[PDB]
Amino acid sequence: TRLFKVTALIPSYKKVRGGRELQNTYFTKLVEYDRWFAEQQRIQKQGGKILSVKMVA
Amino acid sequence: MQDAITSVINTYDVQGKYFDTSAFDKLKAYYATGELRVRAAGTISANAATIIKEASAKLFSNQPDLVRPGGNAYTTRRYAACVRDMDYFLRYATYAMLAGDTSILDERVLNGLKETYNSLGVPISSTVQGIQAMKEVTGSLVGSGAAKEMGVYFDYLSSGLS
């Protein structure tokens, strides 16, 4: 239970951003186990949707 | 920042005392003026753009050198920064009036303002004149008692800058 591969899309509802912000909205990242609960909470509070999570190790 | 209720709570907390008759008198006095304060704040929120515009007009009429070359309002950029500062002052005077205490004015506005303006080159006296223009505009739109109340906080801002 070491690493999670998370594909997530975080939209924007507070405003419209002029910069690219495409990789910032949809991205796949590797997150440690001790951090994943907090990261999932942050994504869910941002309004984003967690497309998938998988076990790497 | 703190309002009148929190100010009374702190002044009785440092003393290790329960609320006595005077404390309840002060709390009742604040609660009496709450509806008036909400009405004045809503009115000023409704008319903030008008107040800023007419006060800026009065200031730049009585201080023509500000908008002429060499003045600290001489460009559209520099003028826009000035009117944004005017919006700051009106918003924080409304906040302080609604709270009933000048703590927010000292904490979020007045602290470090003279140093910032000295660094930028902003004239503090002209800023005070703009604040007094704000007071003159706001009194008519808010009525007599609300004008007295909001003029207290405009005076606090002016004396803080002065």
Binding site: - | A81, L113, E115
Partner: protein
């Protein structure tokens, strides 16, 4: 005023000035320099472009900056890792990250974290995770944790990871709680994983100093903040923000 009258006047000056030039390139250049006036007046048919708002927590004031104030050409160039960039600008982004976190490029000493650099270049980690692992490393601990008391560490970490100074007594209080309880790793995690960091920089943008012209500037920490946004900031050991907000 009449906007139509102003547009007619600017067109008239355009025609007049084009008259005296007697050269096609000069005529077109001055015509463009007047067309910018006409175009801006026509573009402001609706209101002026919206002021950029910097949001805040309940402890510090929320501020606005007129869009006119920001677009004087002084905006810092964002260093972003796109995962499709070639090697050169990938190294450019990495060097920007080093300059931000360590206040300077430490390749001048030959110091780097090679595996972290490889991970950020190839995409295993993002720029945010690179910044976090870089502020939690032995190099950062040696440079900006050991020589300082926890309050000064707090302030310099604000500068290095948030690109700004602390703005509140509540802010230094909370981050001193975090550092005093959990050490450098906890402090860096709290700074990077906050809402403000993702708000401003995100996953792929190296942090930068958010000084005059980038965002609206607070008034209450002005002198201390601009002492902090200076390469002489580590030369001071006494904390300057807890002391100021207590003063």
């Amino acid at each position: 005023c009449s906007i139509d009258a102003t547009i007619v006047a600017v067109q008239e000056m355009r025609r007049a000035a084009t008259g005296y030039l007697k050269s096609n390139d000069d005529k077109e250049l001055v015509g463009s320099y007047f067309d910018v006036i006409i175009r801006s007046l026509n573009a402001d048919k609706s209101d002026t472009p919206a002021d950029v708002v910097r949001p805040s927590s309940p402890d510090r004031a929320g501020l606005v900056l007129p869009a006119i104030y920001a677009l004087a050409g002084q905006s810092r160039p964002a260093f972003k890792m796109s995962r499709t960039l070639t090697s050169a600008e990938k190294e450019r982004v990495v060097r920007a990250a080093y300059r931000q976190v360590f206040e300077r490029d430490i390749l001048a000493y030959g110091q780097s974290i090679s595996y972290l650099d490889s991970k950020v270049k190839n995409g295993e980690i993002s720029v945010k995770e690179f910044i976090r692992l870089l502020g939690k490393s032995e190099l950062y601990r040696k440079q900006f944790f050991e020589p300082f008391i926890n309050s000064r560490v707090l302030e310099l970490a604000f500068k290095h990871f948030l690109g700004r100074a602390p703005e509140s007594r509540t802010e230094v209080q909370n981050y001193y709680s975090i550092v005093a309880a959990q050490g450098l790793g906890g402090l860096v995690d709290a700074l990077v994983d906050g809402e403000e960091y993702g708000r401003i920089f995100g996953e792929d943008t190296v942090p930068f100093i958010r000084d005059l012209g980038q965002e609206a500037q607070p008034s209450w920490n002005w002198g201390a903040a601009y002492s902090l946004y200076n390469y002489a900031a580590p030369r001071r050991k006494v904390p300057q923000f807890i002391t100021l907000y207590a003063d």
